[PDB]
Write an enzyme that holds these catalytic residues in place. Sequence first.
Site, PDB file in Angstrom:
ATOM      1  N   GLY A   9       0.830  -1.261   0.088  1.00 36.62           N
ATOM      2  CA  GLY A   9       0.002  -0.058   0.135  1.00 36.62           C
ATOM      3  C   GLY A   9       0.796   1.370   0.008  1.00 36.62           C
ATOM      4  N   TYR A  32     -10.216 -11.062   3.513  1.00 43.42           N
ATOM      5  CA  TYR A  32      -9.363 -10.145   4.351  1.00 43.42           C
ATOM      6  C   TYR A  32      -9.585 -10.915   5.665  1.00 43.42           C
ATOM      7  CZ  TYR A  32      -7.061  -7.436   0.813  1.00 43.42           C
ATOM      8  OH  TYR A  32      -6.259  -6.843  -0.254  1.00 43.42           O
ATOM      9  N   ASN A  68      -7.077 -12.202   8.069  1.00 43.37           N
ATOM     10  CA  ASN A  68      -6.723 -11.657   9.299  1.00 43.37           C
ATOM     11  C   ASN A  68      -6.859 -12.262  10.740  1.00 43.37           C
ATOM     12  OD1 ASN A  68      -5.822  -9.589   7.703  1.00 43.37           O
ATOM     13  ND2 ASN A  68      -7.671  -8.241   8.197  1.00 43.37           N
ATOM     14  N   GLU A 107      14.397  -8.893  24.147  1.00 41.38           N
ATOM     15  CA  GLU A 107      14.930 -10.119  24.105  1.00 41.38           C
ATOM     16  C   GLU A 107      14.336 -11.019  22.740  1.00 41.38           C
ATOM     17  OE1 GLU A 107      13.451 -12.279  27.430  1.00 41.38           O
ATOM     18  OE2 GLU A 107      13.521 -14.104  26.795  1.00 41.38           O
TER      19      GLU A 107
HETATM   20  N1  LIG Z   1      -3.525  -9.865   5.020  1.00 50.24           N
HETATM   21  C1  LIG Z   1      -3.956  -8.641   4.561  1.00 50.24           C
HETATM   22  N2  LIG Z   1      -3.657  -7.769   3.478  1.00 50.24           N
HETATM   23  C2  LIG Z   1      -4.250  -6.769   3.392  1.00 50.24           C
HETATM   24  C3  LIG Z   1      -5.350  -6.430   3.930  1.00 50.24           C
HETATM   25  N3  LIG Z   1      -5.674  -5.065   3.440  1.00 50.24           N
HETATM   26  C4  LIG Z   1      -4.727  -4.676   2.324  1.00 50.24           C
HETATM   27  N4  LIG Z   1      -3.983  -5.850   2.144  1.00 50.24           N
HETATM   28  C5  LIG Z   1      -2.761  -5.905   1.214  1.00 50.24           C
HETATM   29  O1  LIG Z   1      -2.076  -4.733   1.398  1.00 50.24           O
HETATM   30  C6  LIG Z   1      -1.741  -4.403   0.182  1.00 50.24           C
HETATM   31  C7  LIG Z   1      -2.409  -3.040   0.023  1.00 50.24           C
HETATM   32  O2  LIG Z   1      -2.220  -2.106   0.724  1.00 50.24           O
HETATM   33  P1  LIG Z   1      -3.060  -1.292   1.953  1.00 50.24           P
HETATM   34  O3  LIG Z   1      -2.753  -1.642   3.244  1.00 50.24           O
HETATM   35  O4  LIG Z   1      -4.555  -1.887   1.548  1.00 50.24           O
HETATM   36  O5  LIG Z   1      -2.791   0.085   1.227  1.00 50.24           O
HETATM   37  P2  LIG Z   1      -2.493   1.232   2.381  1.00 50.24           P
HETATM   38  O6  LIG Z   1      -1.753   1.281   3.360  1.00 50.24           O
HETATM   39  O7  LIG Z   1      -4.074   1.715   2.882  1.00 50.24           O
HETATM   40  O8  LIG Z   1      -2.101   2.504   1.558  1.00 50.24           O
HETATM   41  P3  LIG Z   1      -3.216   3.463   0.241  1.00 50.24           P
HETATM   42  O9  LIG Z   1      -4.312   2.945   0.140  1.00 50.24           O
HETATM   43  O10 LIG Z   1      -2.254   3.237  -0.814  1.00 50.24           O
HETATM   44  O11 LIG Z   1      -3.032   4.886   0.905  1.00 50.24           O
HETATM   45  C8  LIG Z   1      -2.275  -5.492  -0.756  1.00 50.24           C
HETATM   46  O12 LIG Z   1      -1.181  -6.451  -1.085  1.00 50.24           O
HETATM   47  C9  LIG Z   1      -3.152  -6.042  -0.159  1.00 50.24           C
HETATM   48  O13 LIG Z   1      -3.524  -7.410  -0.423  1.00 50.24           O
HETATM   49  C10 LIG Z   1      -5.902  -7.082   5.126  1.00 50.24           C
HETATM   50  O14 LIG Z   1      -6.886  -6.632   5.654  1.00 50.24           O
HETATM   51  N5  LIG Z   1      -5.204  -8.187   5.404  1.00 50.24           N
END
Ligand SMILES: Nc1nc2c(ncn2[C@@H]2O[C@H](COP(=O)(O)OP(=O)(O)OP(=O)(O)O)[C@@H](O)[C@H]2O)c(=O)[nH]1
EC number: 3.6.5.-
Lengths: 438, 350, 54, 422
Positions: free
Chosen positions: A143, A224, A228, A254
Amino acid sequence: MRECISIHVGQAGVQIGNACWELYCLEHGIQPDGQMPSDKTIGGGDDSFNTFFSETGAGKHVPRAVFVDLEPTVIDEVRTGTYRQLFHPEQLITGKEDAANNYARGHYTIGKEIIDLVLDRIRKLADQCTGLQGFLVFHSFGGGTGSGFTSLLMERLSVDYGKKSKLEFSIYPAPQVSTAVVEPYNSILTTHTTLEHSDCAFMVDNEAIYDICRRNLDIERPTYTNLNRLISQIVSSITASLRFDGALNVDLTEFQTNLVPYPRIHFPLATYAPVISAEKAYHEQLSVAEITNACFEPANQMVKCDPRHGKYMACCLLYRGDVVPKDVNAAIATIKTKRSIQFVDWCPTGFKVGINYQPPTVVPGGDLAKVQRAVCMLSNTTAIAEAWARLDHKFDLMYAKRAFVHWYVGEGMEEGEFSEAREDMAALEKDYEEVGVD
Amino acid sequence: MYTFVVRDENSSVYAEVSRLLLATGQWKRLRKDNPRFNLMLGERNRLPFGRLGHEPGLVQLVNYYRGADKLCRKASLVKLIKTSPELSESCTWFPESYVIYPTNLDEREVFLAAYNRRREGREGNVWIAKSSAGAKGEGILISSEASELLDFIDEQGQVHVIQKYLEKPLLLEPGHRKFDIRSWVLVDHLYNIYLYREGVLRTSSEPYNSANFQDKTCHLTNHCIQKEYSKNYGRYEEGNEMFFEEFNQYLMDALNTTLENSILLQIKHIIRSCLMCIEPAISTKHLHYQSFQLFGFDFMVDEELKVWLIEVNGAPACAQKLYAELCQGIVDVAISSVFPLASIFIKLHH
Amino acid sequence: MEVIELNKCTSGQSFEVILKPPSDPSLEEIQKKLEAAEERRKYQEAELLKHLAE
Amino acid sequence: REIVHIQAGQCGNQIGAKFWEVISDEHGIDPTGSYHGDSDLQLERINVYYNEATGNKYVPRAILVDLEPGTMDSVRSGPFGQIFRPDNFVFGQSGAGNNWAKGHYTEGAELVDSVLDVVRKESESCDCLQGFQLTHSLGGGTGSGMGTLLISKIREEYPDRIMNTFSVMPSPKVSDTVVEPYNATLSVHQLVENTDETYCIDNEALYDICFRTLKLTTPTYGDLNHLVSATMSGVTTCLRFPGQLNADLRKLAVNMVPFPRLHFFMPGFAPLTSYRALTVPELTQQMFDSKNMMAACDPRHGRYLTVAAIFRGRMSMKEVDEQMLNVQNKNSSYFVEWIPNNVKTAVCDIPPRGLKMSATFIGNSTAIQELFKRISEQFTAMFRRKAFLHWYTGEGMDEMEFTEAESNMNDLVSEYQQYQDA
Ligand SMILES: Nc1nc2c(ncn2[C@@H]2O[C@H](COP(=O)(O)OP(=O)(O)OP(=O)(O)O)[C@@H](O)[C@H]2O)c(=O)[nH]1
Ligand SMILES: Nc1ncnc2c1ncn2[C@@H]1O[C@H](COP(=O)(O)OP(=O)(O)CP(=O)(O)O)[C@@H](O)[C@H]1O
Ligand SMILES: Nc1nc2c(ncn2[C@@H]2O[C@H](COP(=O)(O)OP(=O)(O)O)[C@@H](O)[C@H]2O)c(=O)[nH]1
Ligand SMILES: [Ca+2]
Ligand SMILES: [Ca+2]
Ligand SMILES: [Ca+2]
Ligand SMILES: [Mg+2]
Ligand SMILES: [Mg+2]
């Protein structure tokens, strides 16, 4: 008692944070309104669970946490949800528009405008601590916010809290559930900039979690939410020693001395067993030997890679439930004779072992069946470098054509930061191969 | 439609598997750096195993076992045999070997120790020094004086092995000539061990002379060494290759026995022992991609009809007249077994 | 093989089993990286507006 | 996070009115702006395209623009005509006479400031404006010439917002004037520099689909706009309904546009409409089929840089990945290998009207170069003899500006060709 502050950045960090704090409350008997009928010390106290929860004079148990996202919609759901009563307003920080899957936008353009605010909200929780030991930082690699804002936060935390440990829980990108073509860019950029600032980081490849949910929970198309809840079990298993009475690993420090001898090589492989479908009525309860043996099956790793073809620098076994040390030693004895478990010459061949008698908790109405005993293995193996090699290859494919690079340069990042980040990763791959390959 | 990529253009075996695949009309070849493949016919060195099995919706298979190098390197084969309880230092089918590093960098004094007891007991004390950097017929020394062995190794920069030279090899007649047996073995993704029906003898066309180890042509049986230095190439058999039907007929005529009884039982035993030994380390049973591999086992037979293991090649070529059969067989049990379209092997059970 | 550092409490226990022996940038500098990027953004936008003015 | 929509000229307003009809119905908004849907998903991201007024009225964030009154009286009288904000009709009286120079430099310049006044008003009430969406044609005078004038001025005032267009390209098969190639070439040059994303809606393709596939002997603009309506609804689904992928204009641009100038998309839709729901495999096969493409380019003549796929309706989320993966694994040659995992897939449970399920395709393909080549040959054939040129120089333009527009388009073509051989 020494407090830990949890920081959750971007959608992935926030939603995973949700699943963890839900789980923590269930494990510590804390209700959604923050009350905890078993905590006979009203208003305060320095019990083990107070390392993650503070207390109001009204017997409210509040997480030592901050949630940060550059757009409001995900954190708005925390604000409106089951555990809305748990956090106070100052703990939930949201901007207006997100980083658009763009590291440079998260780090430079939007990051510059919210970083002082976030540090202030954090300074608040820190001020509530008699002996802060440091931070647990949850975020995605892919992200724009998870990658770009997290790395700016980590730089500033080292300035404002130099003596404090910082641990990461990082989501490595997987095309099966990923949402942007440039996530490899974002991953390398954030890893480069965060590397010197993180003492220990647990990577979870969404690919592995996805496939564990399909294979073992019999979920055809994991959400998700499925991912999660499973992730939060591994996280809980890893933090349980900080939240419950014990002798390992009692503080964040540690974690590094037990898993990370080489500072840059600070990415331990997590492996978890057993994962059992709750829809599975009749379930034969696995033994200690069996769940321990399952720790050396790639199918059970948070990152798919082959530890047989690398070397170990450290190994920690964290058992929850009906486990006595005798059975653990018998299981380790037998496994030693079958498995490929090569340690580096300058490390002892061995295992640090922790046992908490309370079996794992499962979110009611979840996908995970209750078990008698479970284990989480943390092993620092050079095999995890396979994930870096995969990621760096994708970066190399796009960057050679400069595909998408104008999006980053347009946010005020210089192109050279790309090749600099990539160089750091090339060095990283080199360090791993030195340590692990004959 | 199945897809595959070719990453070793120098492989005669898999170049043939490639054309067989295309000729079925159910396989499509891709650009070598296209990741959406079912089958990787991989490069010999630094094959990127870590990038396999991460393609959503593609069952992926590679023609190599990660870790098989333990078996297919001079020094590491010696190490594997000495340090594995399943094989053991008391392993009766592997010649006495020692891993020697040149001094510009070990098992030196351990080798000298055993060399002394031989010179002390009047015993035949001829050893052969060789390594993995030895391309074809060069880099080999057959001496009865240990000094010449270690002095020759220090003139080399890489690791070497010293190993007891078989002074009483089985000699074919007429010709009085040394030979070695090449066996082709296919291990599929289930770790079934398949021994190809047809083997071949790489024969010497020069009479064995146990008084002159300096002339490496009646002592070394390499096809390159015979086709050049030997003035009798192709005299007794075409290309110094005697195939099993002839050899077995010989064993019956001369020694009143069969290839199966005298030699093949031992060969199958050696092949099982080696591959079962490393199975836990290289099996892809519960792994996110699958492996198969074609091996070339080379054997020596002494005058007592004992079979000795010389080495294992991990990227073997085939005899000319056997390419079609063995390659069709590779497609059949190693590939199509995994990707079904629309026996020449003996299975060594375990 | 060897079991060491066995600690027991009511919540659980821990121990170590050995099987075999062996053989930052300042606030100011961060500040300047942020401003250096901001200036490149302003410069590129200034060029755009100049071009639009033409 | 709001989008401001602008529709300019005859084509722009006619396709624009249809788009608002169609998505109003999807979000359960009636012609009087009242909500009457039975699903919560309809209102979750409603503000992206709609303003709220008291009485809980929903008013499109829509600006209707034209240099002559004609088409906009038709809108105001049309089905959902009353739903638009009265002040947001901005029009002059002289028309542009199918002349880019009139729209861009003389007649249009006189009207553009009042348009920018309404745009500014709409923006100022936006919590966090994403950017702009403009519907227009390139072959005429107002949509093309004044439309691109608007884009330039909007960029000057909102330089950090996203500019998105639906641009209808001219075809001699559905042609109003012989000067369409001039107007289109002058306009493509503007788009290349001043939009982030452009959906290339080719009248050539719309005609061929109606004639060949839908078996319409005598296709009308109504039939053409039926296809444009469905395509526009499908490609804006990820903006309008909750979801992970391409949920706003910038993230879409970041996923779809690897180089700034190459931001011209081929839209595609299935089933091509005018009793049995298609299977997921049928949707997938058809949506990648050239005959389902809205740009009249052969995708097998180039390569896909990036692709977005959107499936609507209740279907196997599992079966979608299998099909989408199978399409790629089985034609991987037509996807560039130096952008890994460049096909992204979205699902939305709410189907479009009259369909149990549908699929919308958005490709960034180097084959779009065929469209620009086609226009460029038509342009050059006339410009080489300076035919009809005096209608443009008569508005103060010199030939040089034509020459530069032509060079820029030919450059665009060579850029696509550059990446088709990588
Ligand atoms: N395991 C898991 N992965 C997630 C989840 N939400 C997003 N991702 C993963 O994270 C990546 C996308 O990043 P996000 O965290 O959604 O983006 P962000 O940090 O909100 O950043 P921006 O929206 O670009 O401002 C992708 O690889 C998604 O598959 C989640 O709830 N669980
Ligand atoms: N200990 C030993 N005793 C007797 N002969 C031996 C021997 N070691 C090797 N040889 C002879 O050495 C030659 C083999 O060379 P080597 O085993 O190193 O194979 P190579 O790698 O040079 C070619 P390939 O990989 O095809 O077998 C054979 O001709 C064999 O007769
Ligand atoms: N698809 C479609 N194309 C149209 C429509 N109206 C006009 N066109 C096309 O648009 C061009 C004429 O431009 P037009 O919008 O009518 O002129 P303007 O009012 O000056 O912008 C020609 O290429 C026509 O084929 C319509 O309703 N639908
Ligand atoms: Ca208390
Ligand atoms: Ca530090
Ligand atoms: Ca006038
Ligand atoms: Mg986000
Ligand atoms: Mg008209």
